[PDB]
Design a protein around this nucleic acid. Structure first.
Lengths: 268, 93, 94, 253, 254, 256
DNA sequence: ATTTACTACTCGTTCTGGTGTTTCTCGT
DNA sequence: TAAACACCAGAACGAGTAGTAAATTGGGC
């Protein structure tokens, strides 16, 4: 019998695996550990499975997870994304070509960036500004947000590193980047073709994610940072799960992407 | 989206694996999950297809008087009984 | 009022009868019904009290990430496991 | 461990049991039949259990059903209520409250008037006593009955009406008992052991029994009783009858 | 007129109340002869039996052994309203409040209540006398009493009395919730009648068993009370007592 | 620039180098440089450290069946580099540049340049007539009963095998399988275009070969046959340079 | 190297039918 | 006397494991 992926909104957010070998026992996702205890994981219920160091996936596992439409992300320290696997087939050509044309035309690229801006701050972008000029404005507004939130929650802020507070922020955003990429793939678009961000293999993922990251996802990392728990990773991940549930993120991701690209005034 | 519960007995490992793809096997042959209407009816197609000489019953939450409904597949000592619209189960010896 | 599911194993007939008063025994030791929160926690006291040397798990519908929650009583090879807030069940080997 | 009854509103409306012996196995309500197959009934889930001819209840059965707050009704032909068993009393405060209102016809008048107002929607005409109001209520009932026969096109069947109303009388009495009031102490109806049951029921009886019991009678299906019962069942569910009965009584008083 | 049937099925033969046994019939009952039928454990009622009893107006009460415990009774809440309103009228008006409460006092101890002492004052006098009785009984059976194993026997014993008392109230047709001395509780009226005769036999029995000190004091007290209610015909005098109790109001009875 | 197919082994890192562990624990050292894409055949179990290392060096991971017969999962889903996707796209968004690439596909398929002044859909007509002709001609060469498109089961099984290495090549090249030129609208459009170019060279004449016999396992023995072909003839290794040459027909500067 | 189907084999709980003991989770 | 629980043996069923042998696989544009 054929196996098909279920809609993204009906799925659970994310799961984190760390020490075990991942094989397939009777057509089901299992996680066996050194002691030999087994853990069954519903792949058709999770929209993205995060793989921490110490994990060993089997060929059948990666194959099965693709069939059910579940994204596999191998993550680093504090959940930073390293590699990702998914169905090579997938995405209607039209939605890819639709995305492509918007990036190939410099008139339509600006326009679509403007809606991202409009959705970001709530106000339309100022005129007579190029893409790289708008990126300058958005960059300045981002550091402003970061600084104020640190004052609102009362944390010591001096910068945004990529190497305690930054550990919380990076972990939280990494969670958002996961489901966002999983949504883009399921929606039928390419995560490589971005508008605001370019040159990077996850440009389009960052574009959609940065629109709503500061709304709920980021201010929570600051909240946890002040609390300074012994389990900063676990309490950030558990927080994001609740956020995605309450804010109905998965159900909100697909229409968000389609609304952004609709700014091109071109037939979808 | 409503709660779903599937109980399988004497069922081949093919289906026992398939159900673990969407549902959670809390006990031996007992699966629990929360799916939508459309997802529920595909699981039933998996059950009706992959189950050989085995009996399976599926119960899900609804807005009926009881608050839930259930359909069965295969033969078992506990078969459903209709009591004026209300469906219960009897124990056949 | 949310859906309720109770699975009992190696339990004295006292409890197997008590559960049949409110819930529907669809299979051997498997009870399903739709009760409210306070009634659900009354069922759990029936379980915790009347179950001797037996393992019981109770699952009810909520508005959590899974869409449901579950509690266990007694020891069994299938014990619950927490994966960063997410509760799954693992299969312990001998 | 002690077992206590759950709220009426959280319960299933009705169940019908026939031809079999009702025993208690391992502390649970069961129905054994001629062939010897057993059927477990969630007695603490039902607000009222109807017992049709051919049933033989055990001592343990009646005892168990009382503690869980389930009403037992021995029913006749076409579901007419015969006898009933339940907890041997319920609350003193709610009972004395009901009683005092019945002992004073000045306060009796008030309650008869509100029942009238709730039934038809308009306040009762002034300067008319209790026994005078019955003529008005009686005339509107026969007027109602005749009109409905014209709406659904029947010749003015009784088996459907009696069966439907009897079902309502079951849950109504079960509601009154669970609330803590007496089904015998009525205001509009008197002399009968179910006076208060009839009083509360006919306020909302014409609301559904007429739009639906009449519908079934003209269609004239095989086995008219069960299709009336499943119909009433859906009503109690859709119109949330059980949850509204208790506040209705206190609102009337 | 009441009867206790046990260990049997209750069916109807030849238009009459019958009790069928394995041996085939054990008790033939003329339908116009019993005003209330008490059903002890071991009984299995038939539908035909229940159908007949409704038509003739007979009350069915499911009781434990010898009416020691009441579980379920037919005609819930009360049978006829008048008998209830009669009970009600006596409790709602404070002029009628002294009434039998003084008489209950008179029936309890044998001596008439003081002529102008109110209810809570009467409660004090009986309250002082009950603790005196308890102490006095404890001295004769020679048990260690200092306040209120012994208490386990008394509590078990009173529970037995509460059974037949409530069973009498139901058979009489009144409500156990509407009390006079005790109020607000669902078995208030049960407590009132019970305390009248509680000290007569039931309490002297609890003390007697308490003195021997058995391993199973709870069960052997109930079976004792069970035997008392049967031999001493406790229930048969309870019903006229209740009607006598309510008659103190000088108000026309049904 | 090359590629490797690994089977029956665990992929770990034990000294900062790609190693292939066996049941016995035999290792095979693989230079992280020189490899642009690693194909994982069934029986393989990748470790986290391996995936971590492969990401750092920019190597694509593709989960394939035996000899790339079937693709199941690919690393960097949706596409790896943005420009090469846009490169393929621009060729598809301009129908003038669409013709050019169809013309090259035509020339590579049959060996002769397409007749001039022919639209895409006219070319589909021309190629279609010669394909049914070929099928008939091959049917006479092997002496099988042919009436239209047991034999069809062999061909269909064979083409599915070919679609694997073809799609795997597109992935390794860095392009999207959804954006086709001759075939359009379907998620494997581009796979079909390249595949039809070389299907008749080896894959189809073999389907016919097995078709002439009648074994009990035609599906698996056609797949096992194609498996041997792809390995021996190094088809996928020949596929990747072909794809970039096909797209080069658009006369537009290709990415770095 | 992984996964599945197939085959005994052990273990586990559910279930039945046989005696023996009970008529019962208490206060107001 | 009847109805019902507690207890103790037995049969009877399905879940689970270890072992051996077979595949690298449910397709077409």
């Amino acid at each position: 019998l054929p196996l098909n992926p279920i809609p993204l909104k009906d799925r659970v957010s994310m799961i984190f695996l760390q020490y075990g070998q991942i094989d397939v026992i009777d057509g089901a996702f299992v996680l066996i550990d050194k002691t030999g205890i087994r853990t069954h994981i519903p792949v058709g219920s999770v929209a993205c499975i995060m793989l921490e160091p110490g994990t060993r996936v089997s060929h059948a596992a990666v194959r099965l997870a693709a069939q059910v439409g579940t994204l596999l992300v191998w993550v680093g320290e504090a959940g930073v994304r390293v590699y990702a696997s998914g169905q090579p087939g997938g995405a209607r050509s039209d939605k890819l070509l639709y995305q492509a044309k918007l990036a190939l035309d410099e008139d339509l690229r600006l326009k679509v960036v403007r809606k991202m801006f409009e959705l970001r701050f709530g106000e339309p972008a100022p005129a007579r500004r190029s893409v790289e000029q708008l990126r300058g404005i958005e960059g300045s507004r981002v550091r402003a947000t970061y600084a104020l939130l640190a004052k609102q929650y009362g944390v010591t802020w001096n910068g945004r590193r990529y190497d305690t507070i930054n550990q919380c922020i990076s972990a939280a955003t990494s969670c958002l980047y996961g489901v966002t990429e999983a949504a883009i793939l399921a929606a039928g678009y390419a995560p490589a073709i971005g508008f605001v961000h370019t040159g990077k293999p996850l440009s389009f993922v960052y574009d959609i994610a940065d629109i709503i990251k500061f709304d709920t996802v980021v201010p929570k990392a600051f909240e946890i940072a002040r609390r300074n728990p012994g389990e900063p990773d676990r309490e950030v991940r558990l927080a994001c799960r609740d956020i995605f549930r309450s804010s109905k993120t998965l159900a909100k991701l697909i229409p968000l992407i389609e609304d952004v690209l609709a700014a091109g005034e071109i037939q979808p | 989206m409503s709660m779903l519960v599937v109980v399988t007995e004497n069922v081949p490992p093919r289906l026992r694996g398939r159900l673990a793809i969407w549902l959670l096997e809390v006990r031996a042959g007992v699966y629990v999950g929360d799916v939508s209407a459309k997802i529920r009816e595909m699981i039933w197609e998996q059950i009706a297809g992959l189950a050989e000489e085995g009996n399976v019953v599926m119960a899900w939450a609804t807005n009926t008087e009881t608050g839930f409904e259930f359909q069965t597949f295969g033969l078992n000592r506990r078969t459903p009984v209709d009591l004026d619209g209300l469906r219960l189960v009897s124990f056949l010896p």
